[PDB]
Amino acid sequence: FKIDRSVVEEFLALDPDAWERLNADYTARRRIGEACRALSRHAFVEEDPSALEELHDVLALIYQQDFSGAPVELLGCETQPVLRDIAAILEGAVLAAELDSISEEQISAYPRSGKEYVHWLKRVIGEHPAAGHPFYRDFVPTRATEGDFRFYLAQETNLDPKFDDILAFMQIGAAPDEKMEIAGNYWDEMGNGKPAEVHTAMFAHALDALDVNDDYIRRNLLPEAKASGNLASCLAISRRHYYKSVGFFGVTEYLVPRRFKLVVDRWADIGLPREGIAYHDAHISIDAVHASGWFKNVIAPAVDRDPRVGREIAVGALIRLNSSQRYLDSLLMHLH
Amino acid sequence: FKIDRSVVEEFLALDPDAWERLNADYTARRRIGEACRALSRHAFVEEDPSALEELHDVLALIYQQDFSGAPVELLGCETQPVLRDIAAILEGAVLAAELDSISEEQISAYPRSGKEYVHWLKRVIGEHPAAGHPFYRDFVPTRATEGDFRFYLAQETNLDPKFDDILAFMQIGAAPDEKMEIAGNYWDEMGNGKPAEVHTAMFAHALDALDVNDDYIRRNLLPEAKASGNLASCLAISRRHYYKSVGFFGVTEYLVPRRFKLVVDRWADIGLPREGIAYHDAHISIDAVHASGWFKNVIAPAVDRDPRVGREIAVGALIRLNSSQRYLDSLLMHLH
Ligand SMILES: [Fe+3]
Ligand SMILES: [Fe+3]
Ligand SMILES: [Fe+3]
Ligand SMILES: [Fe+3]
């Protein structure tokens, strides 16, 4: 038995009683799981490109269930026993591959107090090539066209359109000072109560301005863009990945202002309609404040409360930097 | 093989490799699951009281993992394949028992438009005895002492201390108008950014004023109080339970002001320190506004977008009313 996206699409078409029958059959469930381990070996041991993309298509389908409002026809379907087993196996493989690129020395050299840890992490981030990647630093200001921006935006639907729920997942069970800061960030994502300022709505207008429609996305989303979006989902939805998540989305806010300023300046230079980039324009100043509060009010208190979590936050940071590097190199490659 | 709380506590003590070994063994996992079906039969077919309380002790332990910040020693432990199978089986049994008390006529008679649906639901709520239960209506104003309030508050640690995360889970994937209202409710739960006004912090002070400490809670929490708290967890954490959740927490906000006004007035009459009930005092006016916005901005738009969800919201409402009735009758019974 083999597992792929269409197989999981078929599961998701089952009726509630068919789901109850599948859930009761630990023989069909063992087979599903062994099929997942086989797909994982192909993707990461053999590094078969089509298997890796199939694995991320499967994860993306599952996370779509975790993050999306359920449709009426599905409300009775108990999908957790099977879909969580699939996710745990493929996730476990995605994350072991990320950690194979991370050395013990990178994540153990840190000062064991909050304010000091922040200086260290910013230096560590600044040393990584993704922090000044040529896609933003060289390609965008000198070459990017409408069609380049359209292709680029298609890749970015993996992350920005779900920041609000990533934050809502992350703050579950968080210590009070960390929860307060994440809460305020979430409330900003929701326009501080004003629908016209909701960040995902403003991001949808950028997609509108360039016709980044659902066919274009599905046809053009790169495998590294899928992995990026799946990594963010994976880390946000498990409580045990919280500290990795703190590092991952901490790096995310920190890099936005430099990246978006290069994007908006070129967008104007090539005459594109400026209300199209209200999202990126706004985030230049918003995420300067988000990044500052994230370091000072999430990362520093976590390290001060238990310095052992500094290692988890560093891992999460490096997972974001490495995956962003692979995604940006792949993007720049396709754009040349 | 039998399953109970201590068995699941032992799972949660396993190291990451022991978890990986358990997850790979679909024979041990089939046994765990059959042990869950057996516990479920005892709890709900035989209605053995100790089995029902054991089932809710197991669920409460699992939800504690879902809602609580993970400890450092546990960050590497892949608990989802087993704990989600346990939860799906015991949850499925808890919810079938709730639905056995709900007739098709109760949840199908509703008008298929939003504003009309709200009037109907309020009438349906007002017809249920939990909406004017003698614990609040008769016992509290005439008899409640310090020790009664202490016992009562111990039961209420099942729900109020996690409203913020219940709301954060619920709004995942919600349609925009519904998400905005849930978001604003969450931001109120977080003191609108002011730590002294965070609702769970103010609720902790009420517990402090009466010495509702962790031993007292563990020794005194009633089985119906556990079921109440597990029902709220169950509905909030699955996307497919969203509309039931909307009905369940809609009833919750709606009933708070009448209930809390009876509590605070007696609290003052018996001379208890009034800063102890800052939480309940505040919520008399806050949840009047929360309930109004929940009907107008969550329930009415959901029904107008797809009237089929009116049946789910009604189920969730009746699940809250029925479970509250059983919990309040059990409480009043123990207090006499
Ligand atoms: Fe944003
Ligand atoms: Fe931000
Ligand atoms: Fe509240
Ligand atoms: Fe409220």
The CA distance from A7 to A85, in Å, is 15
Superfamily per CATH, domain B109-335: Heme oxygenase-like (1.20.910.10)
Contacts of A198 in chain B (CB under 8 A): 176, 180
In chain B, where are the structural domains located?
A: 5-100, 109-335
Chain B 105-144, CB below 8 Å of chain A: which residues?
none
Do the beta carbons of residue B248 and residue B231 sit within 8 Å? yes
Q: Which of B78, B168, B183 sits opposite A88 (nearest CB)?
A: B78
Separation CA A329–CA A331 (nearest Å): 5
What chain B residue is nearest to A171 in terms of C-alpha separation? B165
Residue A198 β-bridge partners: A190
DSSP state letters, B7-57 = HHHHHTT--HHHHHHHHH-HHHHHHHHHHHHHHHIIIIIS--HHHHHHHHH
The Cα–Cα gap between A69 and A87 comes to: 19
Chain A interface, best mutation among B85, B203, B309, B313, by max A CB count within 10 A: B85
Measure the CA–CA gap between B60 and B223, rounded to whole angstroms: 11
Chain centroid, CA A239 distance in Å: 16
Whole-number Å distance between alpha carbons of B74 and B71: 6
DSSP, collapsed to helix, strand or coil, labels residue B156 as helix
SS3 assignment, position B153: helix
Q: Give the HSE-up count for residue B221: Cα atoms under 13 Å, Cβ half-sphere.
A: 22
Q: What is the 3-state secondary structure (H, E, C) of chain A?
A: CCCCHHHHHHHCCCCHHHHHHHHHCHHHHHHHHHHHHHHHHHHHHCCCHHHHHHHHHHHHHHHHHHHCCCCHHHCCCCCHHHHHHHHHHHHHHHHHHHHHCCCHHHHHCCCCCHHHHHHHHHHHHHHCHHHHCHHHHHHHHHHCCHHHHHHHHHHHCCCHHHHHHHHHHHCCCCCHHHHHHHHHHHHHHEHHHCHHHEHHHHHHHHHHHCCCCHHHHHHHCCHHHHHHHHHHHHHHHCHHHHHHHHHHHHHHHHHHHHHHHHHHHHHHHCCCCHHHHHHHHHHHHHHHHHHHHHHHHHHHHHHHHCCCHHHHHHHHHHHHHHHHHHHHHHHHHHHC
Is the distance from CB of B44 to CB of B97 less than 8 angstroms?
Answer: yes
Distances (CA, A) of A285 to A289, B244, B301: 7, 40, 34
CATH number of A106-335: 1.20.910.10
Q: How far apart are CA B43 and CA B96, in angstroms?
A: 12
Q: How many CB atoms lie within 10 A of CB A46?
A: 10
Q: Shortest CB distance from B171 goes to which of A27, A168, A180?
A: A168
Phi, psi of A222 (to 5 degrees): -80, 150
Report the amino acid identity of residue A244.
K
Rounded-to-integer distance, Cα B281 and Cα B267, Å:
10
CB A29 within 8 A of CB A82: yes
Degrees to nearest 5, angle at CA A328 with A90 and A215: 70
Which of B23, B190, B239 is nearest residue A65 as measured by Cβ atoms? B239
A239 — contact with chain B (CB < 8 Å)?
yes
* B165 SS3 class: helix
**Long-range contacts made by residues A83-87, C-beta under 8 angstroms, separation at least 24?**
A83/A8, A83/A11, A84/B80, A84/B81, A84/B84, A85/A29, A85/A32, A85/A33, A85/A36, A85/B23, A85/B80, A85/B81, A86/A3, A86/A8, A86/A32, A86/A33, A86/A36, A86/A58, A86/A62, A87/A59, A87/A62, A87/A63, A87/A234, A87/B80
Using only C-alpha atoms, chain B has a radius of gyration, in whole angstroms, of 20
The single residue listed with the structure tokens 């009448």 is B258
Nearest CA in chain B to A81: B85
**Number of helical H runs and strand E runs in chain B:** 19, 0
Q: Residue A58 corresponds to which tokens in the numbers above?
A: 């499967």
d(CA B307, CA B314): 12
Pick A74's closest partner by Cβ from B81, B240, B308.
B240
B317 close to B121: Cβ distance less than 8 angstroms? yes
Q: Count chain A–chain B contacts defined by CB atoms under 8 A.
A: 142
> Do residues A146 and B139 lie in contact, with contact meaning Cβ atoms separated by under 8 Å?
no
Q: What's the one-letter identity of residue B99?
A: L
Shortest Cα–Cα distance, B314 to chain A (Å): 14
B245: its two tokens: 């959740």
Instruction: List the Cα angle B64/B70/B74 in 5-degree steps.
Output: 110
As a whole number of Å, the CA-based R_g of chain A is 20
Q: What tokens does A251 get?
A: 């790096």
Q: Do A165 and B172 touch (CB under 8 A)?
A: yes
Sign of the Cα torsion A293, A162, A246, A182 reads positive
Experimental method: X-ray
Contact yes or no for B210/B276 (Cβ under 8 A): yes
Q: What is the resolution of this structure in A?
A: 2.1
What's the length of chain B?
336
A168 touches chain B (CB under 8 A): yes
CA-nearest residue of chain B to A80? B84
In chain A, residues with a C-beta closer than 8 Å to the C-beta of B72 are 306, 308-309
Give the residue among B177, B315, B322, B188 at the shortest CA–CA distance from B246.
B315
CB atoms within 10 A of CB B2: 8
How far, in Å, CA of B260 to CA of B142, rounded? 15
Q: If we measure between CA atoms, which residue out of B212, B218, B166, B249 comes closest to residue B53?
A: B218
Cβ count within 10 A of residue A10: 9
The reply to whether residue A193 touches residue B180, judged by beta carbons under 8 angstroms, is yes
Q: How many CB atoms lie within 10 A of CB A295?
A: 21
Per the CB < 8 A criterion, the answer to whether A2 and A42 are in contact is no
**Number of Cβ within a 10 Å radius of residue B41:** 13
Distances (CA, A) of B79 to A167, A213, B83: 22, 38, 6
- Residue B235: closest C-alpha in chain A: A75
Q: What angle do CA A246, A247, A249 make, to 5 degrees?
A: 70
Distance of CA B39 to the CA centre of its chain: 22
d(CA B331, CA B325): 10
Burial (0-12, 13-18, 19+ Cβ within 10 Å), B142:
exposed
Instruction: Copy the structure tokens of residue A137.
Output: 């630093």
